[PDB]
Amino acid sequence: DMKTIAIADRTGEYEQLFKENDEFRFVHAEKTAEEYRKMGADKSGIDAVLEIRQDLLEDPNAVAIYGYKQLPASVSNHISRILSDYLSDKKIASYNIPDIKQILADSKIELSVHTYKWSEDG
Amino acid sequence: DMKTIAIADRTGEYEQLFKENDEFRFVHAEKTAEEYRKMGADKSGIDAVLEIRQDLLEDPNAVAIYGYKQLPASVSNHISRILSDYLSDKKIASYNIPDIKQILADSKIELSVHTYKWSETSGELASGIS
Ligand SMILES: [Mg+2]
């Protein structure tokens, strides 16, 4: 069902990328990972915390997710794809072509494909 | 418990993007979305159809996902980003920049976030050394 993930993003660069869907609620971390750990899931109201210490192009090992339980792969797959898209944009945006930022912005396409449940036939 | 999504792409451009995917089970649509609807989930063996009706650069709205049940937002999330990154890159590659395909490929970051359970006894004997 819906999972709640607290985010402790020390950089403030990445926390804005996480939107509140049906499967996922992202909230700002107010306790440390150890404080969440000790309080337990009943009391914290979270399933896991996303911890990011520093610019992930500088050190990609500086991000981790901790949860009370082993989390389904979808959790980290969704967060990883959100971070990977952003970091790929940032790296191409660093490239030494004088108008790369215009080119990237002009070329940017961001679909939100509509998903529907078919009408029932039964 | 991967969902199976049949791809009905009228353009022939986009199925190649889904051959290497680690979240969903993509297959080629052999029937239309409406036929899969009518035959129902037990007959068809799929959960959803990604339907692409036009080049998404000419008409980005010309795509939709249908399922028998409500699908998690993750399915559209994932599919939308894969298509978006492709179309963005296709447009970037049309500018006059030498080796742009190589550069685009080299600039992709694939971060897989390490995920841990915090460590934390009745039927399990302790060590004999303690
Ligand atoms: Mg075309």
Residue owning tokens 């920049």 = B97
Cα A100 to Cα A92, A95, B100: the distances in Å are 8, 7, 11
Report how far ligand 1's centroid is from the alpha carbon of B72 (Å): 30
Determine contact, residues A95/A51, Cβ cutoff 8 Å. Answer: no
The terminus-to-terminus CA distance of chain A in angstroms comes to: 26
What was the structure determination method?
Answer: X-ray
Helix (H) or strand (E) holding A64: strand A63-67
Residue owning tokens 């039927």 = B123
Determine contact, residues B14/B7, Cβ cutoff 8 Å. Answer: yes
Residue owning tokens 């967060």 = A79
Q: Helices A100-107 and B73-93 meet at what angle, rounded to 10?
A: 130
Helix (H) or strand (E) holding B38: helix B33-44
Q: Which two tokens stand for residue A28?
A: 């700002």
Distance CA(A117)–CA(A82), nearest Å, equals 25
DSSP symbol at B17: G
Residue owning tokens 């403030």 = A12
Which of A14, A115, A117 would you mutate first to test chain B, the one with the most B CBs within 10 A?
A115
DSSP, collapsed to helix, strand or coil, labels residue B80 as helix
DSSP, collapsed to helix, strand or coil, labels residue B42 as helix
Cβ-count burial B97-119 (b if 16+ within 10 Å, e if not)? beebeebbeebebebebebeebe
Neighbours of B71 (CB within 10 A): 19
Determine contact, residues B111/A63, Cβ cutoff 8 Å. Answer: yes
Report how far ligand 1's centroid is from the alpha carbon of A117 (Å): 28
A69 at B interface, C-beta within 8 A: yes
* All domains in chain B, ordered by first residue: 1-109 (3.40.190.10)
B51 backbone dihedrals φ, ψ, rounded to 5°: -115, 125
B87 at A interface, C-beta within 8 A: yes
Q: What share of chain A is helix, strand, coil (3-state, %, to 5)?
A: 35, 20, 45
| β-strand pairing of A48-52 with A63-67 | antiparallel
List, as ranges, residues 89-128 from B with C-beta within 8 Å of A.
89, 91-92, 95, 97, 103-104, 107-118
Q: Which two tokens stand for residue A88?
A: 């790929």
Cβ distance A71 to B115 less than 8 Å, yes or no, reads yes
Nearest to A87, CA basis, from A17, A40, A2: A17
